UniProtKB/Swiss-Prot annotation:
This is Trafficking protein particle complex II-specific subunit 120. Specific subunit of the TRAPP II complex, a highly conserved vesicle tethering complex that functions in the late Golgi as a guanine nucleotide exchanger (GEF) for the Golgi YPT1 GTPase. TRS120 plays a role in the YPT GEF activity of TRAPP II in concert with the two other TRAPP II-specific subunits TRS65 and TRS130. It comes from Saccharomyces cerevisiae (strain ATCC 204508 / S288c) (Baker's yeast). The gene is TRS120. Present with 259 molecules/cell in log phase SD medium. Part of the multisubunit TRAPP (transport protein particle) II complex composed of BET3, BET5, TRS20, TRS23, TRS31, TRS33, TRS65, TRS120 and TRS130. Interacts directly with TRS65.
Length: 141
């Protein structure tokens, strides 16, 4: 047998406009039992996944049936932006959920943060945070 040492390592409804969020959560026992933060993350805006999905899917405009986007976009029916913090509660974590460029049949952003201050450990205990939101559409042409 060969072991080594055990290491010491809200459903918002935004109506097609800008918004905000705030996250200060004490699910951060991943280095020395939730002492403090490694380094900050001052209000990271999440709208870039659905920007670079909702732009080129309707800028496909090649033959759309052969699916050069060949993998299924069932995991792109949410957003799941990420904030992997560097080497108590969550110090700074805000996100401007801007629905002003968004689809009409999506639900959430399962936002996963790699909580560890673990220098190249390949170990980082990533805890995910959901939203389970709903969109009330205001206008169509």
């Amino acid at each position: 047998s060969n072991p080594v040492e055990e290491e010491a390592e809200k459903m918002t409804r935004n109506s097609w406009m800008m918004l905000d969020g705030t996250k200060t959560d004490f699910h951060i026992t991943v280095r020395n039992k939730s002492l403090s933060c490694a380094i900050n993350h001052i209000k990271i805006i999440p709208m870039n996944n659905i920007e670079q999905m909702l732009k080129p899917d309707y800028w496909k405009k090649m033959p759309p049936d052969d699916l050069y986007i060949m993998e299924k976009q069932l995991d792109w029916l949410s957003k799941s932006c990420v904030r992997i913090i560097k080497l108590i509660t969550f110090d700074l974590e805000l996100d401007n959920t801007a629905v002003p460029f968004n689809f009409t049949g999506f639900d959430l952003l399962i936002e996963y943060g790699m909580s560890a201050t673990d220098e190249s450990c390949i170990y980082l205990k990533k805890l995910s945070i959901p939203y389970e939101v709903t969109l009330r559409r205001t206008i169509e042409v």
